[PDB]
Amino acid sequence: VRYSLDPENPTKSCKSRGSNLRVHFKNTRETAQAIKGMHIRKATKYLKDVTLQKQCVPFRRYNGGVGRCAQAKQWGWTQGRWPKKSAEFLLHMLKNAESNAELKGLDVDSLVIEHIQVNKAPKMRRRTYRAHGRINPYMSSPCHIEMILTEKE
Amino acid sequence: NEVVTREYTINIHKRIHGVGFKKRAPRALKEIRKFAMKEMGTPDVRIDTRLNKAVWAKGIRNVPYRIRVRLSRKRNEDEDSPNKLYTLVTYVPVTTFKNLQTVNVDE
Amino acid sequence: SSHKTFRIKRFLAKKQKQNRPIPQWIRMKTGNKIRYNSKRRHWRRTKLGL
Amino acid sequence: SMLRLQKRLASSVLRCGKKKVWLDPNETNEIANANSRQQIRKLIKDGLIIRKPVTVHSRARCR
Amino acid sequence: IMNQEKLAKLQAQVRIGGKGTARRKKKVVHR
RNA sequence: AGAUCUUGGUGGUAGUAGCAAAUAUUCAAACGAGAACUUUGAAGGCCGAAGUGGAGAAGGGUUCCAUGUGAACAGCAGUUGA
Ligand SMILES: [Mg+2]
Ligand SMILES: [Mg+2]
Ligand SMILES: [Mg+2]
Ligand SMILES: [Mg+2]
Ligand SMILES: [Mg+2]
Ligand SMILES: [Mg+2]
Ligand SMILES: [Mg+2]
Ligand SMILES: [Mg+2]
Ligand SMILES: [Mg+2]
Ligand SMILES: [Mg+2]
Ligand SMILES: [Mg+2]
Ligand SMILES: [Mg+2]
Description:
The structure is cut from a larger assembly and holds chains A, B, C, D and E.
Chain A: E1 13-21, H1 25-35, H2 40-51, E2 57-58, E3 80-81, H3 84-103, E4 111-120, E5 127-129, E6 135-137, E7 143-151
Antiparallel strand pairs in A: 1-7, 2-3, 4-7, 5-6
Chain D: H1 4-14, E1 21-23, H2 28-33, H3 37-46, E2 49-51
Antiparallel strand pairs in D: 1-2
Chain E: H1 4-14
Bound molecules: magnesium ion (MG) (12 copies).
One magnesium ion binds near residues 64 and 65 of chain A.
Chain B binds one RNA strand through α2 and α3.
């Protein structure tokens, strides 16, 4: 399928993709920006730390009302959070991409996340009830995610 | 060693001071678990049901001030687990808490 | 209610019998253009005419 | 695995409430095998299902 | 018959609750 | 390009308001990929017979029962479910 930013050498690279994933797009975008460019081992342990609330992801674009934390100072920033669902979804995608690397026969200890992209998926409609006999949307905001890993050391 | 068992006494009064009425016994359980983790260095802490009953003996808000417990670090080596050790915390009924030291207990 | 007439009971019987999914082999017919039973009724979402 | 049916049937057979029905926490698989009132009766006879006593409400203070 | 090993473990199975609860009467298997 | 235009779609607001009426949960185990919520046991509580109990009328119409599933729905979750 057509990824954006096909790798320059699609023999030292592996790919992963997921569509209509039930995670929040804004949190997932921030987490993907946090883990972009990392080594795969570093990214895995960083996402585990985010789940354990020992390292934060900095909320840089979607930061309206996001609180401040001490762990955001590791990044050059002030607002950070710990999106557990986004961390676990990207961990699953990283495991899938590492399995693809194993299938393509390229060692998984020199992989670097060179491309990662989060798109909005079609929203899903639910219904909420308001004060004066009114109905309001309760949309979900799922996301497509894609990533291209690449061998370099 | 690593299969050691010891007997401690915990100042539940000290660790619960300030907590609201409907939270005092659940927080007593949480503080007992945290005490066991800090003492034995094992994130896996199992609390005996008799110990839980002892903590809840006087209701949700009038928790006992001091409690004598026994921490037993034991092998979790029964299945694929992240922790190979765990701490079982049991209840030791005492008549007085005066002059009770933290004592190593044998097998 | 528990007390009901024969006409009402028969009406409810027909509604029960026609509130069911489509068969699987329908979608293999030539020129089907049917994906699902669009006349499915739930007892709590929409109420019957009577 | 999920003994809601067994608790209900045991209550019906023992003619008590679901408060007083005691299912053996160790023989969960054996109790879960029971899907009929005959099997519930067999378990009651075998002592895997026990009717708990009435909670004590003493009138000694009133007397 | 009862020996010391059988008695010390029997105390466990007959107790199905704390103080003030009825004791277990039997646990019989029959196929 | 306008008509508080018609229909459809999409933003900022905004990961914000909010998920605060009726005292309350805890421990261990089981199943399970997965348990704050499922089941079992233990404990602490509540309804307190003008009940949060047991049964009917009207109305609903299969929601009843068992088994299975885990897409969607049950404004968190679910191995549970009207
Ligand atoms: Mg603001
Ligand atoms: Mg509302
Ligand atoms: Mg209205
Ligand atoms: Mg209605
Ligand atoms: Mg126009
Ligand atoms: Mg004009
Ligand atoms: Mg808020
Ligand atoms: Mg609120
Ligand atoms: Mg009362
Ligand atoms: Mg009533
Ligand atoms: Mg039902
Ligand atoms: Mg939900």
